[PDB]
Amino acid sequence: METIAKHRHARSSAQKVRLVADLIRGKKVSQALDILTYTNKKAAVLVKKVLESAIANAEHNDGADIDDLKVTKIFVDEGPSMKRIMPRAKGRADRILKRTSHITVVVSDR
Template identity: 60%
Template sequence: MEVAATLRYARISPQKCRLVANQISGKSVAQALNILRFSPKKAAAVVHKVLESAIANAEHNHGADIDELRVSVVAINCAPMLKRFRARAKGRGNRIFKRNSHITIRVADE
């Protein structure tokens, strides 16, 4: 049985989020939570909340045993960007892309 949790439009770039997501992919749930708890990155806190949500979904909706769950898939996809302009010399402007992410985590029995 595979259970998912999704966070859409997270205000962090997918590239930064994937650095953290690659560390927990394939690990047991307890080990993944421990890695995320002690990681100094901003993405770790966001991914930690989504992982806890996936665990709660598995326990509440399907009666899964938490000790047997593993992180099977961590998908970080691009969300629509916020586009801004920064003033530059001689009346010009440079585009700034503020990137967003869609984070999906799937947990499964061993």
């Protein structure tokens, strides 16, 4: 059973979300929501809502039983950055990168 759920254009960058995804990759959901809750990072708050969406689409578009529901697959691959100008010392200009990312959680029962 596939039942993906994803969050495109996640406005925290991929290297910082990808630390959080390296905790829940390969566990049950019941472990995952709590471990994401007590993790003291922001992308935990940004990926708990994605995994919570994956729960609801699993129960509501196809078969239920959240008890037997592993997070088999989760991958964060980066999205379109956003180009902004930074003024610096001595008249030069920088280009800061408001990077975004694409979170994908694929939850399954088997």
